[model samples]
Target: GAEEEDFKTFLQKFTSSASFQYSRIKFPLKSPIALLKDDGETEQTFPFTREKWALLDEETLKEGRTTEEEGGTYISHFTVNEPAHKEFEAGYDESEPSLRVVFELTDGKWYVTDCYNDWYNFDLPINELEETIQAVQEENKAFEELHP
Candidate 1:
């Protein structure tokens, strides 16, 4: 019960934030972080040195799903209205791509396990894609149920 409640608090705080402060979030030490580069064709893991980019708008989070069957993970989607910059446009295909963030309960605490956006160049590993697809399907199912 405590874990569930704690997760709720985490979700609320995280979702309401305007921006992500990588240093502040609870992320696994060895977990890989991925990013879309300015060139629009490059993707890479977090670098040793910080990279600069244009100002990002406040993130608007969409309610996501959690499943305990597979070690208890929370998956969420959010969109950031990025401003067009010299390097990249604010949105692609008429709208911003939904970003996915996954957190897993490990050793009695939750930590960010993965983070990625559906920008042109970014791609998820097959295993990660499998998990992500399930989460997306769940969201879609919930929507259909409500609308029907």
Candidate 2:
């Protein structure tokens, strides 16, 4: 139960960081991108692209292995990779890049899952996992200080 709660806390911090802090400079634009839409009636524009975000349904989450951790809880992991783009800026490449987000859901709560490079191929190096753990610890400490 403690591990599940810890993981949920990590997930919330991770999402908040991505949406508020890293959305502009990371692999993708790092932040939300603008979009243009035509509904066969009127043209509209918004601040986010459709493909850049994802929703993990029950069926998709059911595809992962469930593990017994603390309190005999089950953990389900899911990953989503989508094409991302950014406006051309000085020293910035115009080529489109991929944005990835990983999530682990356990005990009715979702964890940030993961963030990294190259959505295509989906190979995460061992070092990346270590780095993620370290990052999470650092984030968790800060969050505790702020909230508690």
Candidate 3:
């Protein structure tokens, strides 16, 4: 019924207005803080509160859709007409972990959802529909077996 904001348009505003970026997010954003209680500084994963977030220099995100960085490539994607999920990758000068901002549309507007690392291993997005189902099912099976 309503025309959506061009994703690029939304992204520009999102990076420009500090208020808009902070307010529009669906918080408790996901990320990993390298601390594991009694385990010293081992990497651990969890969601982060809004106050704890440090905005990645997403202005860098405004480059080519698959922009080249010093080491790796920066990537961004979104659908023109229909989309509930979106994200951009900040993979540069690193061979291991990378970052992604998960944006999702809610109530006819787009907003940030996740801020996760370790993309090649984690769940959600990547529209590998069948792969996701089978992958989750495999994990589910292992969990169920452990419980039984």
Candidate 4:
């Protein structure tokens, strides 16, 4: 059901785009959503709508706390087991160690999000993390299959 190219495209958009596009698209459909910023502030909304959505582009990496941002609390990192995208001049190497942003989505939309790393700590209750992990993993697995 999922194609690798589609997954690749989603990953590329997710990694490179400015603002949170998935939020924008899903919020219009009454999805419950939340945005957790680097500053330890969380914005939550139920039955998400245009009124609640923030017009953030995927490339505008200014909203959330991330390891990549110098002032962020946590340092992020990523480990890529599979390597591709050899053509792009920009260095996106799987071999090098790195930090990364972590988020979760629920019910075909984004919610219960956070970014954590060595510099900062974000701990949801164990129950919440467990629920979120299940949701995010399912969605990501579906996403991968769609793109794979």
TM-score of each: 0.33, 0.20, 0.56, 0.24
Whose lDDT is greatest here?
Answer: 3
**CA lDDT of each prediction against the hidden true structure:** 0.39, 0.34, 0.54, 0.34
Residue-wise C-alpha lDDT for candidate 4, range 21-101, written one tens digit per residue: 443243344234433443466654334343332322234223232344443343122222223211111112333222233
Assess candidate 1 and give its TM-score to the true structure.
Answer: 0.33
RMSD in angstroms between candidate 3 and the native structure over all alpha carbons = 15.4
- How are the candidates ranked when ordered by TM-score, highest leading? 3, 1, 4, 2
What tens digits encode model 2's per-residue C-alpha lDDT throughout 1-148?
A: 3344333344344434533323322343234322223233333322333233332223222324343454333333433332221111111123332434444344544433233332211243333443544555565556434442
Clashes of each: 0, 7, 0, 24
* Count of backbone collisions within predicted model 3: 0
Name the candidate, 3 or 4, with the larger TM-score value: 3
Tell me the TM-score of model 4. Answer: 0.24
- Candidate 1 least-lDDT 10 residues: 82-91
Cα RMSD of all models vs. native, in order, equals 16.5, 18.6, 15.4, 14.2
lDDT tens digits, residue span 38-112, model 3:
345444454455544444334545544454545456544332334666666655434432566677777678878
Candidate 2, residue 111: CA error in Å? 13
lDDT of 3 at 145: 44
**Candidate 2 Cα misplacement greater than 4 A, ranges:** 1-123
Highest-scoring model, TM-score: 3
Candidate 3 lowest-lDDT run of ten? 117-126
- Using lDDT as the measure, what is the rank order of every candidate, best first? 3, 1, 2, 4
Angstrom error of the Cα, residue 59, model 1: value is 6.6
